[PDB]
Amino acid sequence: QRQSERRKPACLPPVGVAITGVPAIER
Amino acid sequence: TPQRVREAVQEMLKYGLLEESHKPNLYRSALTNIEVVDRILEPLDLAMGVDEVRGLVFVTVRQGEVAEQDDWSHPLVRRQRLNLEQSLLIAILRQHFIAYEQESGTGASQALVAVDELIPQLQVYLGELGSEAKERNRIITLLDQLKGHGLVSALDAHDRVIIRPIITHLANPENLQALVVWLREQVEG
Amino acid sequence: TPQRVREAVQEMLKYGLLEESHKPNLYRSALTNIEVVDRILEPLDLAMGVDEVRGLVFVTVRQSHPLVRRQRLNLEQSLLIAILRQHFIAYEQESSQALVAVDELIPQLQVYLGELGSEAKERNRIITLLDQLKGHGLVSALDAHDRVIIRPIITHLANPENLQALVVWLREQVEG
């Protein structure tokens, strides 16, 4: 019932990591 | 460096995973060059995970010598972390995926779940709201948040979602054991 | 693989640009290991470009790329890009960092897009355009005295094809 606990970060590793969108060089 | 290997590596880095049922050629190319792909991904602190039974190839953070690197401070990781609510929904979806995968034989199909099946099981834990529209909004928002991690799809015209097989490598027994230990520590004090 | 080389490569891939003034250690590590960086970025169809005049390290598509998205910018952004480029050229011809005041660009924008009739409207338009260019990482944060810093990357803003397109569009806008 508390929003503080519902948004508390859990422990689960990043799986299927996509690249950070782009190398930040649009051109 | 062969053209096919580069193409497959770039595609996998772009999307995060390769599935045999959608991109068979790239999957075959990346499956037969494990050493080359590992050498390519070593400078970026990334590794490739394989699953031949389900026909899946995904990308994970390479494990370093440091005892705790937290795996989320890697520069190339762009998503946010997972909170308790999303972990609970992921556990429910994993149970549904177990049920789907148990009663299946040879052939290709997909794991489809309707929202009305998900609502009461989440009501058991979270609670109950007054109207039905409130609960529908809550479930839709949670599923939209989970779509950003690549675990589900967008809602269909018949109000259903598809559970992606990648979840079977997010809620594998090791990660589940670690999560259970952490949650037990959190609850008891 | 040495740790500093990997750190520099990952930082460059995350941001796309490296400046000696900001991260001297990464700049030194990347500049002294050109062949290693080229070998690392070869499978990704990327290459490293060096400008030791300003200490700028950038990434070019060696050869429309799976990892890179192409974008197109409106006239309201194109003319501001031209103004910033010519201001930086004027600043570097004077011989650090090019400082441009907010009020300086207001007449230059008004003589091409007309006058909105309100100071607040001009300020909001300038702020929105500056934020949009901040999204592309072309200028630095706004200073206290309503000033911005032009980054050296404006020198390598694009190939001469885009410079010709920019000057043609600017001339057409001046024609009105």
TrEMBL record, chain A:
UniProt name for this protein: DUF3375 domain-containing protein
Organism equals Pseudomonas aeruginosa (strain UCBPP-PA14)
Upper classification of the organism: Bacteria, Pseudomonadati, Pseudomonadota, Gammaproteobacteria, Pseudomonadales
Q: What stretch of the parent protein is included here?
A: 384 to 410 of 538
TrEMBL record, chain B:
What is the official name of this protein in its record?
DUF4194 domain-containing protein
Native species of this protein?
Answer: Pseudomonas aeruginosa (strain UCBPP-PA14)
First-to-last residue of the parent protein present:
48 to 236 of 249
